[model samples]
Target: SEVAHRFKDLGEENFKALVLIAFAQYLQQCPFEDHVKLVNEVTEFAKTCVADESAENCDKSLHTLFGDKLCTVAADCCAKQEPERNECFLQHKDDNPNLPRLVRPEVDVMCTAFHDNEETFLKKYLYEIARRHPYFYAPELLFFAKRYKAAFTECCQAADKAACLLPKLDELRDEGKASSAKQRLKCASLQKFGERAFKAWAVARLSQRFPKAEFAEVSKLVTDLTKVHTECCHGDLLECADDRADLAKYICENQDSISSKLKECCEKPLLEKSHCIAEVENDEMPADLPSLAADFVESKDVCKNYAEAKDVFLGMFLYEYARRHPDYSVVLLLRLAKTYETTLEKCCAAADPHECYAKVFDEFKPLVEEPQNLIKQNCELFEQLGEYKFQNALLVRYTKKVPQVSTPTLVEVSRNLGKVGSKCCKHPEAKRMPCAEDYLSVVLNQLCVLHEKTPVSDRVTKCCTESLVNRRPCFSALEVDETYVPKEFNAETFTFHADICTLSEKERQIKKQTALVELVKHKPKATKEQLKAVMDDFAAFVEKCCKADDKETCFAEEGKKLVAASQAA
Candidate 1:
């Protein structure tokens, strides 16, 4: 009732348009015929109420038709002027967490619609996805959209559409689950790391972004960011998005003047503005900033300060040190903090704290040669080999050195390595090298954890159990397993059969692991390249045979090539 009365000022056309759009959104789960019937019923009724103010109880009729809740929401929506009125309606339709259940259509039905017009179908699929997951990030939805399209395109070609499509639908389901998991992980990590630590990271990075700004000026900018972070991490992703957009505007509007490069970011669309501001490269370090060693020595008094506020102490160091060493990757800077923390922990625990802290400068001297050169060279080669080949290179190198490790472990590590190289290494160049270093450090750290989870060969176990400082060097010395034999392919996972084509991602991973394991079993003497060649050959055969009119014939014929390649190697 209130909605209809409020919407009367929208004029006849806009009023009808507002109700009609809201009508479809609220009743999206209805059967197609029911949807069409009600839409037409609501259309003319709304048209009349706008022109004839005398229409009997039209407000009550509108309330009954739309349900009282949506009518109430639309009342607020109609207050906005053109372009925003309908936008507001749709935005609030599912704004309440209690949204509709997803009404998934049959695979064949979806494909036919897609086949007729992808433009509409893509929006249709996105609408279904968004209605169910109101809190999901927009770009993550874009990825889901892409995955949906890829599935439809691929599976729609098959003779039995749903049979082929079901696995991919399951894949999309898993991906959605993963996306949700990641959202929770983000919130947990924010809380786990503490707001102050994150603020420290931001301050450090922002100082690099505007090296010319006085330290006080940079501190002001960081406070504005952390204030949003503190509230947003309490777990309203949608509100988190709104707060970020608001914060972006605050930065654009309130900051004294942003970078010439940053000005371009400030004017970007609502979604990209915040990300652009956060991720843009830091400015070059100034020549006049204080050295890290001097900063460390100043903090090392009686050690009580370091004992209590360890995180902030390191955070403060991060802020100051990053200002001086602009070229140092965040990964390397973080390592500096790690080393600093380690040294402080050792000294503060010592009987004579000054005696232990005295060698701190001497200890800092050797930190440069390992991780410093690591990120530069790793990024250089990551760029050269490309993500696919780069991970393959790293994968083979690891498997060759540590053949006793499970194929699944090597594969998982390599996949993450691929992701690290692609995601971290290609960030804006200022971040590129550092991002690679930071995540790659995690990859190596994870590798140690994995080995520790299941004690590997004594040499590997010994290295992995050692401290972070010693692990890399110990791993460096692990000898090649020249006579390594893959344990029996006992599970019969890689059947080279017709059903292999329908394997889901997890199943596909197992098959790949089995394939790699079998290759080594067939030819322990094969060079890594030769082993990889055999795997590639087997993969090609799987693709070719799966689509064949007579799968058995193709499998029998080409399967021989895999055997021949392994033997010849």
Candidate 2:
């Protein structure tokens, strides 16, 4: 925080967390003449030497690298105590030309490097990824690192290494492809849905995320960002990155009038500044602001509000509804507005338009809530069981319901289901159910793309072809494939330890997922029923013990039921 405050003078807010040389190297939009831009050779030289664990190994090389007059200030940092010295070293930009564009080693060279020094090579891989993707949040960056680790783990062990790793590398490339497609998707949505709809969504999402922002600032951000998207979405990523960075600086200049949280976000790296501002929590909504439905759902002059100017009326409703419910998907919000319009049109034609408004609440109730309830019902299980069981639970549920479906497809869908849950749940209580429906609809539509040509079953195949609005519920209502023969059973014992009681929620979820996956793979001969029976037993045990007065004791006693039941069949 002190670093945040002090770096204000440097106008290098982005580099506040970095070492002295590193800070200088990445400090864009700053007067480079005032700073020492250490040539790449010196910068890299310093990195490797200082990274050394032993002072005996590093001191000479470190001293030699800083011998130039340009190095005089950096050299003094070394004279400081070790902790201060490290902090000082981190404060510079070093102007390393090699950074922002990191190592992309050829396959054989990379594998060879990995084999020669696994830990150091992987550590470099992680660091290089972090540098290359400056915008990535900490968890997102680590997720990329872990996925890359898994890809290597899968391929490097194969009998034909390059042949194996090449495809795995290609899989990692897909991370960017989907992200790129999203920009295209937003651009497409703008044209397809009209700029007014686009503006409405922009207004909603921005204002919701930065509720403390003045309405004027929100309006400016929405227009500015929308303009950037419109311009750059048609251009290359480099242009987009630059244009957007320029926009953030302009936006940041308004820090005095905008949100404090947003001001903090503005201090981040150019790439992350907007997104850092994005995840901010909502403000306390004004109690006096009239609900869009309050008067209309009561008795707006129906002929005047709707009959005279339908587009403006609905447009006004959408803007207010979107602002009020920031968590709603643009589609749902649009749908909600359309619902009101549809009902009012018929009501306006009726004998008593005023009386029709009285009953407007009926049509609105189910229209708003049916999907919410569906998402709520499914998501409650996710909260109760944690992501692991929730995913595996959905996996088995869908697998049994959809006959002749491939196991891999079921696994993929269930994994996506868990992701939808993760995205929509936990912290954002108001948005959870609405977001779940919106997000889950997307993944479910992707399911149809994979299965469209390769028909699995009549119901499953037909459901994919259904319109997006109707498709989810159709798929959700699938029945068991009773015609298909169940596989044979292979019994296996399960284990539990007292340590389970002490592990935190996340640690327990990790351990449980491992145990469950091991049980399924090792007992491959078992029927789905045999697997599910034990699974149900285990699920029930967890749900009960998670709330018990004596958690460890409950697991000891009831957990015996799980191992016994697991082995019995």
**Candidate with best lDDT:** 1
lDDT of each: 0.58, 0.55
Please give, for residues 1-569, the per-residue lDDT of candidate 1 as tens digits.
Answer: 43345355444433333333334444444333443345456655655666676585575533344553334332566555444553454344332234454556888688889899985576546555544543344434544666678888998988998888888888888667545433433333344446654565566667667766666667777776665555433322223334555667777784445444577777776445665776676654456656665656754453786777776566667677777666565545655667777877888887977677766656555665565466567778888988766766666666767777767677776667677766766566555555655455455555654565566666676665453334555665664676676555342344466666787655654575556755554444557666666666666877787887866756556655654554465
Worst 10 residues of 2 by lDDT: 13-22
Model 2 lDDT tens row, 1-569:
22222223233322211222232323322333323344333434434543453433344322233333234443566566545554454343221224443336677777777778865565555444333332223322333455666777777767887788777777776654334234434544454345665676676666555555666667777776776665433222223334456666776786655555565777665445655554556555545676555656665585577877786566556556766676666556666676777777787888977777666557667767767777777777777978776777776566666646555566666677787777676645566755677666556755664565367677776775543445676877775666655543333224565566567776665555544444544454456667666665665776677677756777667777776776677
- Pairs of residues at least 3 apart in sequence or in different chains that clash in candidate 1: none
Predicted structure 1: lDDT: 0.58
lDDT of 2 at 477: 78
Error of 1 at 499 (Å): 7.9
